[PDB]
Design a protein around this ligand. Structure first.
Ligand SMILES: Nc1ncnc2c1ncn2[C@@H]1O[C@H](COP(=O)(O)OP(=O)(O)OP(O)(O)=S)[C@@H](O)[C@H]1O
Ligand SMILES: Nc1ncnc2c1ncn2[C@@H]1O[C@H](COP(=O)(O)OP(=O)(O)OP(O)(O)=S)[C@@H](O)[C@H]1O
Lengths: 110, 722
């Protein structure tokens, strides 16, 4: 996580872009067996240090789209957090006006 | 309840037997008049007395005499209980001490007329540790008992054979060390001393408190904080209040031995502490004894710390011995020492507050006669960041300033007429060197919320988000959600953003650890964030203040490595333990976009331009001696809307009052020329300060911060900011 912070710390040519190279050195220390699995999360593809995306090393890339509107149903039923569910309200009214319709923070609306 | 514990009256008589509280107080406890009860006192001092309690006296007041209050080491108005001991008897050997301040002037045999006619055929209770002045042979004679063998709750009769001792020797150093420490001699740190009492509650008077908890909570307490804050004084207070066998060793004293002799007397101190069933053993200067293992450059230091590390856990459950260590710095200690097995209670002493400094001055001016002119409160609230030894030095320098303006003679001309003034204390305060300054302070400030204008809705919502989870736990343990930890402040660079967190810390009543900008860079170059968050969690609840996060973002990697370690230690904070964090910034273009993401510092608060009544509360504080601004057009300057760029209307106020000071000094100049300076300000200097008025921020930057209203759009490229 916070791989975009490592991506954004490349200014100052205290660079620490070679820490990514150390990570990729330890990545081929891992065999294709031993059943470990590496997951990289980022928010910005331009400064991704594209030596990372050499095939066989983080080979699959999944683009996460704009999120589904039905987060407000399971943000409170599956997480009570000392407060009950929103009883007798129209939950389709929130996605009808499409409030916060770019990413998360529907949980921040809750 | 302890119903016998009541206050002390003055002298109705002289001797220890003739003291009176009430014959009802001999009737509910059913203690006889003839029995030798033990009247309690400070420094575990209980004295044997055949108490003649009389019902005609006040039932809450023991008639303790003038030399009895020194014997019990108590003052007038102190609670005293009683303990019966009917095991008294007389032996042939005894030891009494005359003192040349009193007895010198009369001679003869050492059991002569000077103690006969009041202890004729006596069998009256004397006690080792008691000194009573009895007039005999037309002269006052003191009598200190120093040695008694047969059950020291003892009896002597000067009509029997006396082992009379006749050496008149002064013990004025022992007289000043008769009390030498106490809970009344410790002030400002009542919670820390209460915690210490809770830790050492088991070796004294309740050793069988192990069926409640089998941990017997751990052998080893650390006292750390600033140097010179009386950690040794705290150790002596525990030493003389617990009454256990106290075996302190100085660290440099056990380091000053030769090769192979460092274990000598260090093993012997623990072997001596193993014997007594109440036993506390204390070590001082742990940093000199046990440094970090990297800095152990010599072999003798490794030998010493190996011997100590063997002797700590090698001795266990034997006479419930408790070690205690005092140090000046917590992270210089060997980390193998502080763990869960040994040395775990890292309680901190800390520098005192204004009430703490006031209490330190109150207990330091007890044994000194002031001139009854100062308030002893002005020095308290104009000393900031002062250690207790600095306050003792300040009192010493004030007394020396009082001494220095007197003629030098040997008689008692300033001995009786000693007089310390407020100007002497100001002179001592000016020539002072408080080395507790620049330390990361912990306090609850007094910035008095009505002084801060701010905005009403912003203040209300910050009142919600800070105090309402805290001060209403029933609306925080049963109703609510996850608390949104953290809030960020931004806007114009000076417009009322610093004191809002101060007012939050005031009317939340929590500690306020504040760091302003480049203090992180200075302390990192000169870890430190780890100690900051350790102090924040140890002083829980607290509100962190990241004042001027914008300033450290102009250091650009060129030492940007500390802000990610800031977010590393901030993400290592649980939602409990009631810690709070506040970030402050001015120019949000270099906002370091890992801040605003959720789970981190996330609550966006935009501080706008202030309201028209922001000038009203400025006149509340007052410091140049003439009457305040009054009956002038306060709101009409706001009607002109000039100077209406954020804060810094205090520049206008200070400029007008400096013009007033110039008017006062010109009136003083003409008064001194010719041989009521019109003290209250008229509107003319306010008008002239309005003429010399500048906007602090531009309207272009107002438009820029208006464009920064939706500054939550992060994790995207800058786009050149069109
Ligand atoms: N809590 C306190 N109550 C009363 N006096 C205090 C207190 N703290 C400090 N002082 C005064 O400050 C002096 C400091 O003396 P010390 O007890 O030697 O301090 P210290 O903290 O033990 O210094 P080190 O690090 O052990 S050498 C004391 O002798 C007191 O006069
Ligand atoms: N609305 C207001 N009402 C009264 N006083 C105000 C108001 N806004 C600002 N002030 C005063 O303006 C002065 C400066 O405010 P600050 O918030 O301390 O500025 P600052 O530049 O953020 O300080 P820093 O960050 O430590 S340099 C203080 O004396 C405040 O009391």
């Amino acid at each position: 996580d916070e791989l975009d912070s490592i991506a954004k710390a490349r200014g100052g040519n205290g660079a620490a872009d070679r820490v990514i190279n150390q990570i990729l050195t330890e990545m081929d220390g891992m065999s294709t067996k031993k059943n470990v699995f590496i997951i990289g999360a980022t928010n910005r593809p331009d400064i991704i240090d594209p030596a990372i995306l050499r095939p066989g090393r983080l080979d699959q890339l999944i683009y996460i789209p704009l999120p589904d509107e039905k987060s407000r149903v399971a943000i409170l039923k599956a997480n009570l957090r000392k407060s009950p569910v929103a009883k007798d309200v129209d939950l389709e009214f929130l996605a009808k006006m499409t409030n916060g319709f770019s990413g998360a923070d529907l949980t921040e609306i809750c | 309840n302890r119903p016998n514990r009541l206050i002390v009256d003055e002298a109705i008589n002289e001797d220890n037997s003739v003291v009176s509280l009430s014959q009802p107080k001999m009737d509910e406890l059913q203690l006889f008049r003839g029995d030798t009860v033990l009247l309690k006192g400070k420094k575990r001092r209980e004295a044997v007395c055949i108490v003649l309690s009389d019902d005609t006296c006040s039932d809450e007041k023991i008639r303790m005499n003038r030399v009895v209050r020194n014997n019990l080491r108590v003052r007038l108005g102190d609670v005293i209980s009683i303990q019966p001991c009917p095991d008294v008897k007389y032996g042939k050997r005894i030891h009494v001490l005359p003192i040349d301040d009193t007895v010198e002037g009369i001679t003869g045999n050492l059991f002569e007329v000077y103690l006969k006619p009041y202890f004729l055929e006596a069998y009256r209770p004397i006690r080792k540790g008691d000194i009573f002045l009895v007039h005999g042979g037309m002269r006052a004679v003191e009598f200190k008992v120093v040695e008694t063998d047969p059950s020291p709750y003892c009896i002597v009769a000067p009509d029997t054979v006396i082992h009379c001792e006749g050496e008149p020797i002064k013990r004025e150093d022992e007289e000043e060390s008769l009390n030498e420490v106490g809970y009344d001699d410790i002030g400002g740190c009542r919670k820390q001393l209460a915690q210490i009492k809770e830790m050492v509650e088991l070796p004294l008077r309740h050793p069988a408190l192990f069926k409640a908890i089998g941990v017997k909570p751990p052998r080893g307490i650390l006292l750390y904080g600033p140097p010179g804050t009386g950690k040794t004084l705290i150790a002596r207070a525990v030493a003389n209040e617990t009454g256990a066998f106290f075996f302190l060793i100085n660290g440099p004293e056990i380091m000053s031995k030769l090769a192979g002799e460092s274990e000598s007397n260090l093993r012997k101190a623990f072997e001596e502490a193993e014997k007594n069933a109440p036993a506390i053993i204390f070590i001082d200067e742990l940093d000199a004894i046990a440094p970090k293992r990297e800095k152990t450059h010599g072999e003798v230091e490794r030998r010493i710390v190996s011997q100590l590390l063997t002797l700590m856990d090698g001795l266990k459950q034997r006479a419930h011995v408790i070690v205690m260590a005092a140090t000046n710095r917590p992270n210089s200690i060997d980390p193998a020492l502080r763990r869960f097995g040994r040395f775990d209670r890292e309680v901190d002493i800390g520098i005192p507050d204004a009430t703490g400094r006031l209490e330190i001055l109150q207990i330091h001016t007890k044994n000194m006669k002031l001139a009854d002119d100062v308030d002893l409160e002005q020095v308290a609230n104009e000393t900031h960041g002062h250690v207790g030894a600095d306050l003792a030095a300040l009192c010493s320098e004030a007394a020396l300033q009082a001494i220095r303006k007197k003629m030098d003679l040997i008689d008692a001309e300033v001995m009786n007429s000693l007089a310390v003034t407020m100007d002497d204390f100001r002179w001592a305060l000016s020539q002072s060197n408080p080395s507790a300054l620049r330390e990361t302070v912990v306090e609850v400030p007094q910035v008095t919320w009505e002084d801060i204008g701010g905005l009403e809705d912003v203040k209300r919502e910050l009142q919600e988000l800070v105090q309402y989870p805290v001060e209403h736990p029933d609306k925080f343990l049963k109703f609510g959600m996850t608390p949104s930890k953290g809030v960020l402040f931004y806007g114009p660079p000076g417009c009322g953003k610093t004191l809002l967190a101060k007012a939050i810390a005031n009317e939340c009543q929590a500690n306020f650890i504040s760091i302003k900008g480049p203090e992180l860079l200075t302390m990192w170059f000169g870890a430190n964030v780890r100690e900051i968050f350790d102090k924040a969690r140890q002083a829980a609840p607290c509100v962190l203040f990241f004042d001027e996060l914008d300033s450290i973002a102009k250091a650009r990697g060129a030492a940007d490595r500390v802000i990610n370690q800031i977010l590393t230690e901030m993400d290592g904070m649980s939602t409990k333990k009631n810690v709070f964090i506040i970030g402050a910034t001015n120019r949000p273009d270099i906002i370091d976009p890992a801040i605003l993401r959720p789970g981190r510092l996330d609550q966006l608060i935009y501080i706008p331009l202030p309201d028209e009544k922001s000038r009203v509360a400025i006149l509340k504080a007052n410091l140049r001696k003439s009457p305040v601004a009054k009956d002038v057009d306060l709101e009409f300057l706001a009607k002109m809307t000039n100077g209406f760029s954020g804060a810094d209307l205090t520049e206008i106020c200070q400029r007008a009052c400096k013009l007033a000071i110039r008017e006062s000094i010109e009136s003083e100049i003409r008064r001194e020329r010719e041989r009521d300076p019109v003290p209250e300000i008229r509107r003319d200097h306010f008008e002239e300060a309005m003429r010399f008025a500048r906007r602090s921020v531009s309207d272009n930057d107002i438009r820029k911060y208006e464009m920064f209203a939706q500054t939550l759009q992060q994790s995207r490229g800058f786009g050149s900011f069109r």
